[PDB]
């Protein structure tokens, strides 16, 4: 089975160059085309270019011609993507993809289309430094106590880089939970919120705790959210 | 460069219904080298069709591709729960390969007005010198919604950001969160903080607000 494994996420300063790797296992490596496709947050897929290892023949999209270099190391079945003069607009998930083949096995006739994809590599172009978030409570309104539904949550603000994961009551509470996509502030730091709706009548008999985890800064906070 | 147009960009359909997605090319696609991919949130794309109509082994046969030249179509005979995702077409008929902008197939459901909640800044944050006010628009449909922040009836601009969740897998609704941020000093210069919401399910704008220090 053909598998593609990419290198880990990276934070790069504006103007620098980034190199992403993609190691293939299974099937042939030298005679099948390998391409790189990127996807900026909330945007569509964009083909950047590709390479055919055996002939060391590259093919770059005009938009990247002059800023990109794709190479392949046949000795380790690894393909590389280098993108220079990075700008914030280059922040995206970069995927390597190999064309599929016909019939059984994976050494059949090539189809051109991308049948095999790597897991993707998030490249963040920023001047920001690693920072853990502050976790603030979003206390349930005291204007709904008597019956009805109440909303409460946690504001996870000013962290870098992505990601952050949030759970409630150590994963025991999932019903009604909404954890929003982070937004990028003018400071270059991220902020996100997580909320949950629950019966107003439970605010005095049940404890609600948001578990926030930001591995890069080792920020692991369990914030108890209660009525003010 | 061959430009691929996928219109509409979104299709709201019900489970079990048939779906036909269009991909129009600005010029003839050589040898019908047109592919279709499916992509779910947080996942890598998956090849569904290649060569305009060929389906790789493993891909459900409820997916079929047709067309040639500059007119291609992906057909989903009957939508299963896992078929609600984004679909991209791609042409590789010439060295410069291009993708369409994608079409999101989402679940159509009855209109649901948002339940609005406003949250004043926490005492903990205020102690740090900053004040973030959060507005939550919960469980609404369709996705289109608008939030306007007003401070002492003054419309705000440039000091807020918002984001929206993926369609809920269980009730097919969306939720939106918006944060208004000011320095503690500026926060203390105003009294009324309000979030005004507009949505198809609301005959008139809904406003939630609070008075600072009350």
């Amino acid at each position: 089975q053909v598998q593609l494994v990419q290198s880990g996420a990276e934070v790069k300063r504006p103007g620098s160059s980034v190199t992403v790797s993609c190691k293939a296992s299974g099937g042939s490596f030298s005679t099948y085309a390998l391409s790189w496709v990127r996807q900026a947050p909330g945007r569509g897929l964009e083909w950047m270019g590709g390479v055919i290892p055996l002939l060391t023949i590259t093919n770059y999209a005009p938009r990247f011609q002059g800023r990109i270099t794709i190479t392949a190391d046949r000795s380790t079945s690894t393909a590389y993507l280098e993108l220079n003069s990075l700008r914030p607009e280059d922040t995206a998930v970069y995927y390597c993809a190999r064309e599929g083949t016909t019939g059984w096995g994976w050494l059949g006739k090539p189809i051109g289309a991308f049948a095999h994809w790597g897991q993707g590599t998030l490249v963040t172009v920023s001047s920001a430094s690693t920072k853990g978030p502050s976790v603030f409570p979003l206390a349930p309104s005291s204007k709904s106590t008597s019956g009805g539904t109440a909303a409460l949550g946690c504001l996870v603000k000013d962290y870098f880089p992505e990601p952050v994961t949030v759970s409630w009551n150590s994963g025991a509470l999932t019903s009604g939970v909404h954890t929003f996509p982070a937004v990028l502030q003018s400071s270059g730091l991220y902020s996100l919120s997580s909320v949950v709706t629950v019966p107003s009548s439970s605010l005095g008999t049940q404890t609600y705790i948001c578990n926030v985890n930001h591995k890069p800064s080792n920020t692991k906070v369990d914030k108890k959210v209660e009525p003010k | 460069e061959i430009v691929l147009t996928q219109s509409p960009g979104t299709q709201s359909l019900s489970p079990g219904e048939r779906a036909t997605l269009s991909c129009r090319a600005s010029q003839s696609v050589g040898n019908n080298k047109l592919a279709w991919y499916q992509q779910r949130p947080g996942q890598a794309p998956r090849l569904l069709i290649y060569g305009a109509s060929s389906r790789p082994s493993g891909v459900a046969d409820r997916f079929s591709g047709s067309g040639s030249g500059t007119d291609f179509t992906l057909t989903i005979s009957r939508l299963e729960p896992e078929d609600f995702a984004v679909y991209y077409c791609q042409q590789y008929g010439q060295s410069l390969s291009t993708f369409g902008q994608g079409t999101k197939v989402e679940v159509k459901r009855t209109v649901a007005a948002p339940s609005v909640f406003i949250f004043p800044p926490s005492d903990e944050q205020l102690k740090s010198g900053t004040a973030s006010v959060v507005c939550l628009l919960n469980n609404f449909y369709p996705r289109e919604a608008k939030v306007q922040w007003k401070v002492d009836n003054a419309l705000q601009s440039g000091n807020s950001q918002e984001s929206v969740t993926e369609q809920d897998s269980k009730d097919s609704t969306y939720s939106l969160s918006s944060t208004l941020t000011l320095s503690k000093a500026d926060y203390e210069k105003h009294k009324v903080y309000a979030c005004e919401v507009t949505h198809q399910g609301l005959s008139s704008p809904v406003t939630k607000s609070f008075n600072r220090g009350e």
């Binding site: 099948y32 002939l55 023949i57 090539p110 051109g112 | 060295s95």
Partner: peptide, 16 residues
């Protein structure tokens, strides 16, 4: 078309 090169290569090593 660059995307047709590998198909051609396939036929090559398959013939001789």
């Amino acid at each position: 078309n660059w995307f047709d090169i590998t198909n051609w290569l396939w036929y090559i090593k398959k013939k001789k």
